[PDB]
Design a protein around this ligand. Structure first.
Ligand code: 37X
Ligand code: 37X
Ligand code: 37X
Ligand code: 37X
Ligand code: NAG
Ligand code: K
Ligand code: K
Ligand code: K
Ligand code: MG
Lengths: 241, 255
């Protein structure tokens, strides 16, 4: 890649971040202001309903929870075998964590080595998953492409339907399916469920929150890898234009 | 024939990843659970002292109040006292930073959009921004590759005239590549040396620092250069380890 292209893409990225900074402030800062009043009211409500507790003592209890969260414990275990397996999973997938992370010197030393060896290893698995699914999808798309060719239909119409099949696959497993699960377990809206899924499978990560579950995460990460690769290809078309 | 060899590789690497995760779960439990039990007793002792000193509050009420205090802390605003001392996580500067953590896939722990519009925009912004940033990072990688390549060519040409084996030259170049990471991302940036290395590795591999401090952390040319060069350098490190794992896998499968 030429240096002239690198400086142009850098400028587009800086511009895109300014657009992001402007829209996020516009959509999120007024709600945060109103949520400060929600806190103040809920605080004044607690002191009124529990007169034996005063504002200074309530602030002392909040700072203890701050100390606990800073110590790496949310006041159910975080470092049991099962929870440690999911934690090791968020490391090698690069999804990450919020406040629950190693706090010991040895735990930090191991996490550095574990990530450096594990992230390439999981990328190898994910590369193979995407390739296996791509062959399964490619064989299915070939039967549809052969059928539409025999009944004389244009190539532009053939690729248009192939994109609908790809979007529907993502709509079923990563839009509709989690909207049903997260509305039953957590009671979240379709948008709160879809937001959780996009953020997890792009590996941005949600912060702090058996065979079919790990299979869904693997196919999901493979699917969004293909989605972001396709959007990347679309950006190469816009750049050439 | 090649289709059989393609599946045999995915199945074995799946088993190796499952084994790697069982090892990780076992070692993280061994290293972090004793510290967790120790910190939980302190919280339980403090929570029971509160109920004892404040008779008008029960265990059910305190459990409900702590859930709300954690919800606010994780949102980015610690409830102290009128929250006027808590810095907004959604000003132009902070949102610029937030947008960065989205497109780099680093994330920002528990700080995320809390409105419908913010969540809708963040979905579209992520799906479009992550491939866009990937282009900037591949470009930075290509440039740094050309710079380091020309430099290694001069070192190799020097060792060639000094009658040194190809095995020793490749080994020496690996030391230079490793030293390039120690100087720019360990030595160049009260925290200990391990805390500095852990922060760098976790951030630049895009796992993300998470939430170093409760309710988010506080806040240009050299920094942006260090981040871009850093992400590009770690992308190269992980790529090389990936290539090595492909050799090992092929060695076990073909022989
Ligand atoms: C400035 C940003 C922080 C705002 C935090 C607002 C605070 C707590 C304040 C209490 C402070 C105590 C010292 C409002 O408290 C609300 O919490 C709800 C859920 O528990 C309850 O349903 C509701 O009755 C209560 O008023 C938490 O609300 C959030 O809770 C999330 C689930 O954790 C919800 O996904 C989210 O959508 C909701 O907005
Ligand atoms: C952030 C630093 C990244 C550095 C990447 C540099 C790296 C590979 C890693 C070398 C490690 C040595 C222990 C190319 O790496 C990348 O270069 C890109 C173009 O720049 C290519 O597009 C890409 O395909 C390639 O993988 C090329 O280095 C090579 O340069 C040769 C010049 O003659 C040297 O003869 C050779 O000894 C050296 O090995
Ligand atoms: C540890 C040995 C490698 C040294 C690398 C140093 C360097 C010069 C840096 C610029 C000052 C090549 O070093 C030397 O390489 C010679 C060719 O071999 C050139 O003739 C000479 O001009 C150059 O200084 C590259
Ligand atoms: C060919 C596999 C793909 C390349 C990856 C193998 C890697 C280490 C890269 C990791 C760097 C992390 C900062 C070690 O490869 C080493 O393998 C040794 C085997 O005994 C050789 O003696 C040594 O010369 C070689 O560098 C050398 O990269 C070039
Ligand atoms: C009530 O508030 C005052 C002022 O901060 C403080 O001195 C007092 O000790 C608090 N009450 C209790 C029971 O701690
Ligand atoms: K992440
Ligand atoms: K990531
Ligand atoms: K994160
Ligand atoms: Mg804050």
């Amino acid at each position: 890649m030429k240096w002239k292209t690198v400086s142009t893409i850098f400028l587009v990225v800086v511009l895109y971040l300014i657009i992001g900074a402007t829209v996020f402030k516009a959509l999120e800062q007024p709600h945060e202001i109103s949520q400060r009043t929600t806190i103040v009211i809920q605080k004044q409500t607690f002191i009124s309903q529990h007169s034996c507790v005063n504002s200074t003592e309530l602030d002392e209890l909040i700072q203890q929870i701050v100390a606990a969260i800073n110590a790496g414990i949310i006041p159910i275990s975080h470092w049991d075998l099962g929870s440690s397996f999911f934690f090791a999973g968020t490391v090698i997938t690069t999804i990450g964590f919020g406040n629950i992370s190693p706090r010991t010197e040895g735990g930090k030393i191991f996490c550095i080595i574990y990530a450096l060896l594990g992230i390439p290893l999981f990328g190898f698995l994910l590369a193979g998953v995407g390739d296996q699914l791509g062959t399964i999808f490619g064989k299915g798309i070939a039967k549809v492409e052969d059928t539409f060719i025999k009944w004389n239909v244009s190539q532009t119409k053939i690729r248009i339907i192939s994109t609908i099949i790809f979007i529907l696959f993502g709509c079923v497993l990563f839009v509709a399916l989690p909207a049903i699960i997260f509305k039953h377990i957590e009671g979240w809206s379709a948008l709160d469920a879809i937001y959780f899924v996009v953020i997890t499978l792009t590996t941005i990560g949600f912060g702090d929150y058996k065979p079919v579950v790990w299979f869904w995460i693997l196919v999901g990460l493979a699917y969004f890898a293909a989605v972001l690769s396709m959007i990347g290809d679309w950006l190469r078309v816009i750049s050439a234009e």
